[PDB]
């Protein structure tokens, strides 16, 4: 028996969303990662209802979404992760109602493991060099720059992976035109799992760790 699949109705779960001027103009746009499918919605004020423009079956797992419009940019480049380390920075193109992978970079293997990045995506709105990190001591720093034609040139990954330190959440704070500070709720699970007694559960709580990925140092330093 040979079976063939058909999606008689796409998913209806808004597991993620990100707001931004994605079409380029001042028109707001909200992207919803509904799991396998990614959709874009425009909140039409003339009618009140939100119109979902595109429902692209992504064939992956969008662990996180974090849009970013560059310094002096009309549209915004959505950063997406999947089951594999293939990080996709794509920008919407209203020419024919279709997306476009502006840059598909390879980070790690497939499978959302603890050491394979692709879980959390922390953008720096007051700067560049977005962090793309996993749950267990895996975090790369993609430096974004503008070419002569304002191209979104992705730099080399400046890995600042910790040692047996779990990551709760990661967000990039807007610095005052200085090196972008990136805070994360990190917890050292290595120093606790190496004692016979049992008191390691206490006295070891989460901690805010902020790294500065200055271009001068060319690496994310705490």
């Amino acid at each position: 028996m040979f079976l063939y699949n058909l999606t008689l109705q796409r998913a209806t779960g808004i597991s993620f969303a990100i707001h931004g001027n994605f079409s380029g103009t001042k028109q707001q746009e909200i992207v919803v990662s509904r799991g396998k499918i990614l959709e874009l919605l425009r909140p039409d004020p003339n009618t009140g209802k939100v119109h979902t423009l595109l429902t692209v079956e992504v064939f992956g797992v969008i662990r996180s979404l974090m849009a970013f419009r560059l310094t002096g940019g009309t549209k915004d480049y959505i950063v997406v992760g999947s089951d594999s380390g293939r990080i996709v920075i794509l920008e919407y193109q209203p020419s024919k109602n279709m997306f476009e992978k502006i840059h598909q970079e390879t980070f790690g293997k497939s499978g959302c493991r603890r050491i394979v990045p692709g879980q959390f995506l922390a953008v720096d709105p007051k700067g560049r060099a977005v962090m793309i990190s996993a749950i267990e001591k895996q975090k790369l720093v993609y430096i974004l720059n503008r070419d002569a034609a304002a191209r979104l040139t992705i730099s080399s990954p400046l890995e600042a992976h910790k040692a047996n330190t779990l990551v709760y959440h990661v967000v990039g704070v807007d610095v005052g035109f200085e090196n972008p500070m990136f805070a994360c709720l990190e917890m050292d699970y290595e120093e606790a799992d190496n004692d016979p007694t049992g008191e390691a559960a206490a006295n070891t709580q989460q901690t805010l760790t902020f790294y500065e990925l200055d271009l001068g140092l060319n690496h994310v330093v705490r």
Binding site: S84, G85, T106, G108, K109, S110, I154, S156, P157
Partner: protein, 93 residues
Amino acid sequence: PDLIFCRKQAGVAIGRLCEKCDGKCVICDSYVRPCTLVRICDECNYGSYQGRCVICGGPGVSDAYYCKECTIQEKDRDGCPKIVNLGSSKTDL
């Protein structure tokens, strides 16, 4: 004859190969059906390292690819596929 590799953070640098070592993959070492292009780390294209073969370690004549039997196995998602070991290190003849 167990060759070692760099296996560092795969940057945004494309791969290369020599006039004789251009067909086979940097890891699979096969000439059958190249699937994807290989890459390198930041310490693989730096000054003298500009445009060097990933297998022959000399002049580059093409782009380093992976074998279809090595890209389907997720082998390309590892670190820098540069063929470097204790013998094939930076201070080599």
